[PDB]
Design a protein around this nucleic acid. Structure first.
Ligand SMILES: [Mg+2]
Ligand SMILES: [Zn+2]
Ligand SMILES: [Zn+2]
Lengths: 928, 73, 186, 182
RNA sequence: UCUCCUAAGAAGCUAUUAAAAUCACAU
RNA sequence: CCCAAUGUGAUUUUAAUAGCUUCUUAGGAGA
């Protein structure tokens, strides 16, 4: 009975046709995402909501629609306050319509409010569903995509319908949410204008706005003088930021009158300086953000201002035309003849930069100026032909020759005498546990450009900046161990000078020629020029010819000598300090021999309580890495330069690393293309920058794990306080809190103990905390890679171990075993048997197929095979004894052929130690 | 051992085709590479011996490239 | 030892052992030990020259072996690979690989890559009626341990030949070698 | 002169050893021989040291001489390249875009679009050929282009009559089309 | 005079360190 | 033809250092 008179009052004055969403007079109960900060709790988590009874409209032909009336009950003082604040914002088009009334329940009067025509879900549900992704629990994301016509309900019956790599059509489905997000950004700026001109003060959060962009919940706000209101917006814009590029929200800013039904803007072809458009875009959408934005990063105050301003530039640089970015060139005179040379750069992140040492007239060029003008792409691209290459989606600049080059890869040579020997010892039998799986795979002429097209996985990614600016200060605590700074050309060490100098310099010699031809005062004067000027450079892509388990091609980046020569002199003092340290998180430089593997594993186990082990994978890692995380890695390495470089010298160093190894021109098949982002593996800092990125993604997972936990369920009063402080430092302090960056680093280093080497990691972690959600786990790595790396990480490529007496399942492609050695037990590494057998059977040169020329090639493979002798599978333990019996055969045949050829034997019989175990056992015992 | 002997014979057979300058026909090398790379990834010998009959038929179709009556001794 | 100083060294230590065994005065033992010490030092100097000459010859002998035998591996590479392939194809002993190799000795060579899918096209040269008699049966051709159905036959002048024309008695009238076009049957 | 003193002292001792002479004078002769031999060993050790250092000096001078020869050889190669590329720039088309700009400065990517006389199109399949190059003239980069040649992936010349839906399985894709600015 | 020793010169052996070259392995 | 960055092991050669051994010269002490 009584539900009907209540339902008719909830309809009220409005034209509506409501059906109840639950029981007639009691509240509904729903599970929803909230941005919360309070005396008791803080975080961004799912909570139960219990206050509200809900009704839904039918249309005027008896069918249900996406429009809900939400009704809730109050204390009378709170009802008076929310009515008082509503009557000030009442005129604003960004505010949801409210009705305030008194009605009877259980025989007594209660004050109610009704909110009209809300969507089922809020902006916080969209932001939580995409930032905390899991493919077995997608029901809110599926219901949002179907409700707003992004796809049919049949779309989710595909295999891998979400994998950015296996189903790139998902980017079209997410881009259909784009203008629904852009209209919510515009209504936020209208609501902030209304709060200011009404004199209202209050924090605004994603859960108080619906998916039509209308605002409600004015009960938290307070009054001030009518000219002087203040909306507070740090958590709102920062949690939303990564959704703005994923849904391509500003895609409408590229049309006449920003109307998707009108044509594109035809930009002036010669224009490169978009500074006034960047400032006009910031005031449309981010008007109340309250921190200074610099369109060009040459004006920034420190590294934290560079990361703040570069994060807005990755969003706005999607509106402007692709031909606008890259080197800026000018016409100059050498002995009266006109050159065309680079005199600046326009970056997607850093804005416009101009060179300080431009001279318009010169009489002669020194050796240093001939290197700068021969490295610069300006003369090569201006004299080459136009190119329209339909084999790729990457932007193609020019063809340097009249013919296209197609490069093949050939098969490996077969060492038949070793295979005939192995088969005589009973290897390669049918049903054997050891078999050939590693081969040399041939490639046709399409392979070089087919592998280059994978740079298509690099997509412009905007970060949560309030999170990234805390993570960069905890990531830097892993690098307090080391010294660093600049050095003179007298002090630089080069590992091998008989290696390529890159394009065009490989026409005239290997790296030895350029180090011999320039004196140390030509070398130091090239380095000191880069602290004032940007040198853009060309990079070759080269195919590898080497043994593998997989049939797809591999390429490496041949960076130019002007880049490598000046990057060694900036970074090498730090990189030599990382490789000399022992017992730290980054294990670059530690050997596996002489007890070094056992010393590494007992260092991660540390003082961890309830320990498990895990390890993970990064899909498409070098291709998919965001420009914002590769910039951050270079700023963290550059923090050592406080004594020897000014702020201006450290900016022009950063612009040179961007212009040479991040966004750059790639020489592939004899033609120039623009690389969109990601690591160029062959960059002088390759393994060390990957280790900073690997720590950053592992620190990010632990922030997201602790802040998305329900803070009322945490039993330990220390971790409730840690979670509260973490939210304040992340989203409400605007400067670094050194005592908390030390407290979070000390918590993390006890409960989540890492070992890291480029793109490979192991972690030993407290399983009782990880299963409560107080530290990261493999489910928290799926979610971070989905919104921050644009790849789906399948749990089938991860691993975990429960018993530490078995060690990690893999690190550096090697397995671990616990074995007795002397009076006590130690961990030894062992390879895959198929790997060591494949390297004996197949070789990359014909002369390697005579064993009498190559006996020490088999000694080296036996040093890696030795730990197999201690394995419980006898078919693995036989692989070492095969190599020792072959080394004996080869020395008997060498001795026979030498005596047949010269009638005289060798006096050096000392080869006799290489076919006995004592030489190989000594490689794995401590005390050297 | 016939699965290992087929995979090793495929490495020698493409090495004979590469020395006869089959790379000088883009249309034909792209088929020999696919037959080779499939025989190495195979797990049934009946698939591998069918792909070996197609791959060897390239060498036998090149009349005068090998003195087959002298190689059969 | 061939070293001449060895002889001296040996006779010097023999005289030193003789003097102490005879119980001679210690000043005589010192004089004999001193002549032994120089004879030993000259024997060790001759042995140091032997140690350097033996290494110098063995290094040059090792480098000449590596130099000459690397060149032999690199020059014969085409003849070695073809001899290796046609040795390995015997050990597999597969009936389809044997059948195409035995046909290619006689000149019964394919013009295409041999296809694997059903109803795919194959073309093969037939040298003479002696090969046709073994290979063909009515509407069918047998090759690579598979049955093929003939869809046309063509002579050396590119004229079509009907299957009723190819018989031993009529065979000298045809322009050999023929091309047979056939289709995979299963 | 230390060798001459050593040799004459050897003969002066040896003539007394021959007849036996007397230890009184044989000890004096032995001391003269060993003193002269010690000074001869000092001079002979320093001479042998200086003969080892003479090779180190001359080989370092040959390393310096070859390093200047190679610096000179690469410097004229870098000049020969730069002063060859400078001849390919058609200054009539290049001056028109550089004079129109605000600061005398332009993006690099628009130079080949707006100044290049010649285009190459690389095409993976017949559907892409029909979309980009059908007939004998086509428009790209807001300009008109006329086809001068087509070649296949083997660098064999292809005639425009051979490129059809029926014949497309017989060609070696990708095709490269070369065109001149109209 | 002999013996011992302290220093220097020369020869013989050994250990260790440094550099170069080559082969092998990992990210 | 092209052939990256970073780290590790093995092998060979050369140089240096330290110690040991022998001879010689010089001085001192002792008997
Ligand atoms: Mg791993
Ligand atoms: Zn700034
Ligand atoms: Zn510095």
């Amino acid at each position: 009975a009584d539900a009907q008179s209540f339902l008719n009052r909830v309809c009220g004055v409005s034209a509506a046709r409501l059906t109840p969403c639950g029981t007639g007079t009691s509240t509904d109960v729903v599970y929803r995402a909230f941005d919360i900060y309070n005396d008791k709790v803080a975080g961004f988590a799912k909570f139960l909501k219990t206050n509200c009874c809900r009704f839904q409209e039918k249309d005027e032909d008896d069918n249900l629609i996406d429009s809900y009336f939400v009704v809730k009950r109050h204390t009378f003082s709170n009802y008076q306050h929310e009515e008082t604040i509503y009557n000030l914002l009442k005129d604003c088009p960004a505010v949801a319509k409210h009705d305030f009334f008194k009605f009877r329940i259980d025989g007594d009067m209660v004050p109610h409010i009704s909110r009209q025509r809300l969507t089922k879900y809020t902006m916080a549900d969209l932001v939580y569903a995409l930032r905390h992704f899991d493919e077995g629990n997608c029901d809110t994301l599926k219901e949002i995509l179907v409700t707003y016509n992004c796809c049919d309900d049949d779309y989710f019956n595909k295999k891998d319908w979400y994998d950015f790599v296996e189903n790139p059509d998902i980017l079209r489905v997410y881009a259909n949410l784009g203008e629904r997000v852009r209209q919510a950004l515009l209504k936020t700026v209208q609501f902030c204008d209304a709060m200011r001109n009404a004199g209202i003060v209050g924090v605004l959060t994603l859960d108080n706005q619906d998916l039509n962009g209308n605002w409600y919940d004015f009960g938290d706000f307070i009054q001030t003088t009518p000219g002087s209101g203040v909306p507070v917006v740090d958590s709102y814009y920062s949690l939303l930021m990564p959704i703005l590029t994923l849904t391509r929200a500003l895609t409408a800013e590229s049309h006449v009158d920003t109307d998707l039904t009108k044509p594109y803007i035809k930009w002036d072809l010669l224009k490169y300086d978009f500074t006034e458009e960047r400032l006009k875009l910031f005031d449309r959408y981010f008007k109340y953000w309250d921190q200074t934005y610099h369109p060009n990063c040459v004006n920034c105050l420190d590294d934290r201002c560079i990361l703040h301003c570069a994060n807005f530039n990755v969003l706005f640089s999607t509106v402007f035309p692709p031909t606008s970015f890259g080197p800026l060139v000018r016409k100059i005179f050498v002995d009266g003849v006109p050159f065309v040379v680079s005199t600046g750069y326009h970056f997607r992140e850093l804005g416009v930069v101009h060179n300080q040492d431009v001279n318009l007239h010169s009489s002669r060029l020194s050796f240093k100026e001939l290197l700068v003008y021969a490295a610069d792409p300006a003369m090569h691209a201006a004299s080459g032909n136009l190119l329209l290459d339909k084999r790729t989606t990457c932007f193609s600049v020019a063809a340097l020759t009249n013919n296209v080059a197609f490069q093949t890869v050939k098969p490996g040579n077969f060492n038949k005498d070793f295979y005939d020997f192995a088969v005589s010892k009973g290897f390669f039998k049918e049903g054997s546990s050891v078999e050939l799986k590693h081969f040399f795979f041939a490639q046709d002429g399409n392979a070089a450009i087919s592998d280059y097209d994978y740079y298509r996985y690099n997509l412009p990614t905007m970060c949560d900046i309030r999170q990234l600016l805390f993570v960069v200060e905890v990531v830097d605590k892993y690098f307090d161990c080391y010294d660093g700074g600049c050095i003179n050309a007298n002090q630089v060490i080069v590992n091998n000078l008989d290696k390529s100098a890159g394009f065009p310099f490989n026409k005239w010699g290997k790296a030895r020629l350029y180090y011999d031809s320039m004196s140390y005062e030509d070398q130091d004067a090239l380095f000191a020029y880069t602290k004032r000027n940007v040198i853009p450079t060309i990079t070759q892509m080269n195919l590898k010819y080497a043994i593998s388990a997989k049939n797809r091609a591999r390429t490496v980046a041949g960076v130019s000598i002007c880049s490598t020569m000046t990057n060694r002199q900036f970074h090498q003092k730090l990189l030599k300090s990382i490789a000399a340290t022992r017992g730290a998180t980054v294990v670059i430089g530690t050997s596996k021999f002489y007890g070094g593997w056992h010393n590494m594993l007992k260092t991660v186990y540390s003082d961890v309580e309830n320990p498990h082990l895990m390890g993970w994978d990064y899909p498409k890692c070098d291709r998919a890495m965001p420009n914002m995380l590769r910039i951050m890695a270079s700023l963290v390495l550059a923090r050592k330069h406080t004594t020897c470089c000014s702020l201006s010298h450290r900016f022009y160093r950063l612009a040179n690393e961007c212009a040479q190894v991040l966004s750059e021109m790639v020489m592939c098949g004899g033609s120039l293309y623009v690389k969109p982002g990601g690591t160029s593996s062959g960059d002088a800092t390759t393994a060390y920058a990957n280790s900073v990125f690997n720590i950053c993604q592992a620190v990010t997972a632990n922030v997201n794990a602790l802040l998305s936990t329900d803070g009322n369920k945490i039993a330990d009063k220390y971790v409730r306080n840690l979670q509260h402080r973490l939210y304040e430092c992340l989203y409400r302090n605007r400067d670094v809190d050194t005592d908390f960056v030390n407290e979070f680093y000390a918590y993390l280093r006890k409960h989540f103990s890492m070992m890291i080497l480029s793109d490979d990691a192991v972690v030993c972690f407290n399983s009782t905390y990880a299963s409560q959600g107080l530290v990261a786990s493999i489910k928290n790595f799926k979610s971070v890679l989905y919104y921050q790396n644009n790849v789906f990480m399948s749990e089938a490529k991860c691993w975990t171990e429960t018993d530490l007496t078995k060690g990690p399942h893999e690190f550096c492609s090697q397995h671990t075993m616990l074995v007795k050695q002397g009076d006590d037990y130690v961990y030894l590494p062992y390879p895959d048997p198929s790997r060591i057998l494949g390297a004996g059977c197949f070789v990359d040169d014909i002369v390697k197929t005579d064993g009498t020329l190559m006996i020490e090639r088999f000694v080296s493979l036996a040093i890696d095979a030795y730990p197999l002798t201690k394995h419980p599978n006898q078919e693995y333990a036989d692989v070492f004894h095969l190599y020792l019996q072959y080394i004996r055969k080869l020395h008997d045949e060498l001795t026979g052929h030498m005596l047949d050829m010269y009638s005289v034997m060798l006096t050096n019989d000392n080869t006799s130690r290489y076919w006995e175990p004592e030489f190989y056992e000594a490689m794995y015992t401590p005390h050297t | 051992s016939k699965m290992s002997d087929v995979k090793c014979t495929s490495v020698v057979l493409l090495s004979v085709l590469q020395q006869l300058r089959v790379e000088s026909s883009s249309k034909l090398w792209a088929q020999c590479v696919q037959l080779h790379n499939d025989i190495l990834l195979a797990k049934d010998t009946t698939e591998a011996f069918e792909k070996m009959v197609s791959l060897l038929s390239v060498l036998l179709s090149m009349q005068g490239a090998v003195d087959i009556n002298k190689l059969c001794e | 030892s061939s070293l001449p100083s060895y002889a001296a060294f040996a006779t010097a230590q023999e005289a030193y052992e003789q003097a102490v065994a005879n119980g001679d005065s210690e000043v005589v033992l010192k004089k004999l030990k001193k002549s032994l010490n120089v004879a030993k030092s000259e024997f060790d100097r001759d042995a140091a020259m032997q140690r350097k000459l033996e290494k110098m010859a063995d290094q040059a002998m090792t480098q000449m072996y590596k130099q000459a035998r690397s060149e032999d591996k690199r020059a014969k590479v085409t003849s070695a690979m073809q001899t290796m392939l046609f040795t390995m194809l015997r050990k597999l002993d597969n009936d389809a690989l044997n059948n195409i190799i035995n046909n290619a000795r006689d000149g019964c060579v394919p013009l295409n890559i041999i296809p694997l899918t059903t109803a795919a096209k194959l073309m093969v040269v037939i040298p003479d009626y002696n090969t046709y008699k073994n290979t063909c049966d009515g509407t069918t051709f047998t090759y690579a341990s598979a049955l093929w159905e003939i869809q046309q036959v063509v002579d050396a002048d590119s004229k079509i030949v009907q299957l009723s024309e190819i018989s031993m008695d009529n065979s000298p009238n045809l322009a050999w070698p023929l091309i047979v076009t056939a289709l995979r049957a299963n």
